[PDB]
């Protein structure tokens, strides 16, 4: 189904970038338009850390104190005054979209500045990390803060994860978390065929019904994934998102492969 029709039906804006890493075939629709990426960036942050810490060293611990805690940290809030391994920081951020786990991960990498430097190195001059959780969710269409375009984000996920410098172990670890995440079930996972394995990370900013999902979709029989980025927003600050838009956009898009 035409994506413009999907936009029409949902009165939302859609940004898609799909890349079948086996063939190199790309599907694009508003792929160079900026969207607040929200929690989908957790995938990017976790992957950058895993480039620098071998699987075996994920047992290393970090101390968490009261200053680390930000809103919506279902796992990390129980860790004040305690220490936590890097493994569990990643599991929390990925599976529960723990905000404190994410910020901590960023801190471990060296700060936002270091994350930006690494995106530039991968050739991504678009994805613009500026704020930490949860401020990164205050999206304003008039601001480039914490936004990326589906094409940029999608090329970065491909380079970081689908075909980057991660070991076997750390790739499996990150992907298993994305495959089992129950939070993206009403999204990409909901619109692709049941044959398809979907490893995703969703996100939702506070404003303009900014709702997203990024995934590594593995068609039945294909070991190479298809990287799929779906960013969506609406015109009003207070609009609520309808997850069916992402489910349907994914369904349309999968027909191209």
Q: Taking each helix axis from N to C terminus, what angle separates 41-52 and 112-121, rounded to the nearest 10 degrees?
A: 80
Rounded distance, CA 152 to CA 149, Å?
5
d(C-alpha 108, C-alpha 76), whole Å: 15
Any idea what DSSP says for residue 196? -
Q: What are the tokens at 22? A: 């086996």
Residue 176's nearest CA partner among 50, 1, 23, 10 is 50
Rg of the chain on CA atoms, in Å: 17
In order, the DSSP letters of 78-116 are GGTTSEEEHHHHHHHHHHH--HHHHHHHHHHHT-HHHHH
Domains contained in the chain, CATH given: 1-257 (3.40.710.10)
Assess contact for 185 and 51: CB atoms under 8 A. Answer: no
Query: On the CB side of 194, how many CA atoms lie within 13 Å of its CA?
Result: 0
**Among 195, 187, 253, which residue's Cα sits nearest to residue 221?**
195
Counting beta carbons within 10 angstroms of the beta carbon of residue 211, is it exposed (0 to 12), middle (13 to 18) or buried (19 or more)? buried
Q: How far is it, in rounded angstroms, from Cα 126 to Cα 152?
A: 6
> What is the maximum span of the chain, computed from C-alpha positions, in angstroms?
52
- CA torsion through residues 71, 74, 76, 82, sign: positive
What Cα–Cα distance (Å) separates residue 27 from each residue in 16, 151, 159?
Answer: 7, 10, 18
Resolution in Å, one decimal place: 2.1
Q: At which residue do the structure tokens 């790739």 appear? A: 171
Which phi and psi (to 5°) does residue 167 adopt? -70, 175
CA 44 remoteness from chain centre: 7
**Which residues are within 8 A (CB) of 22 and not within 5 positions of it... i.e. 6 or more apart?**
222, 224
The Cα-based distances of 142 to 13, 112, 139, 160 in angstroms read 15, 21, 9, 29
């Amino acid at each position: 189904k035409e994506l413009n029709d999907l936009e029409k039906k949902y009165n939302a804006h859609i940004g898609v970038y799909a890349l079948d890493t086996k063939s190199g075939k790309e599907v694009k629709f508003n792929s160079d338009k900026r969207f607040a990426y929200a929690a989908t960036s957790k995938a990017i942050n976790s992957a950058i850390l895993l480039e620098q810490v071998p699987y075996n060293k994920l047992n290393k611990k970090v101390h968490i104190n009261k200053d680390d805690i930000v809103a919506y940290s279902p796992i990390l809030e129980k860790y004040v005054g305690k220490d936590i391994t890097l493994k569990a920081l990643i599991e929390a951020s990925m599976t529960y979209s723990d905000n404190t786990a994410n910020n901590k991960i960023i801190k471990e990498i060296g700060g936002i500045k270091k994350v930006k430097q690494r995106l530039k190195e991968l050739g991504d001059k678009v994805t613009n990390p500026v704020r930490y959780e949860i401020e990164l969710n205050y999206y304003s269409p008039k601001s480039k803060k914490d936004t990326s375009t589906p094409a940029a984000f999608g090329k970065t996920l491909n380079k970081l994860i689908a075909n980057g410098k991660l070991s076997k172990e750390n790739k499996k670890f990150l992907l298993d978390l994305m495959l089992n995440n129950k939070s993206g079930d009403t999204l990409i996972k909901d619109g692709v065929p049941k044959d398809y394995k979907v490893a995703d990370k969703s996100g939702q900013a506070i404003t303009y019904a900014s709702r997203n999902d990024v995934a590594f979709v593995y068609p039945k029989g294909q070991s190479e994934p298809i990287v799929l980025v779906i960013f969506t927003n609406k015109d009003n600050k207070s609009d609520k998102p309808n997850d069916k838009l992402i489910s349907e956009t994914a369904k349309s898009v999968m027909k191209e492969f």
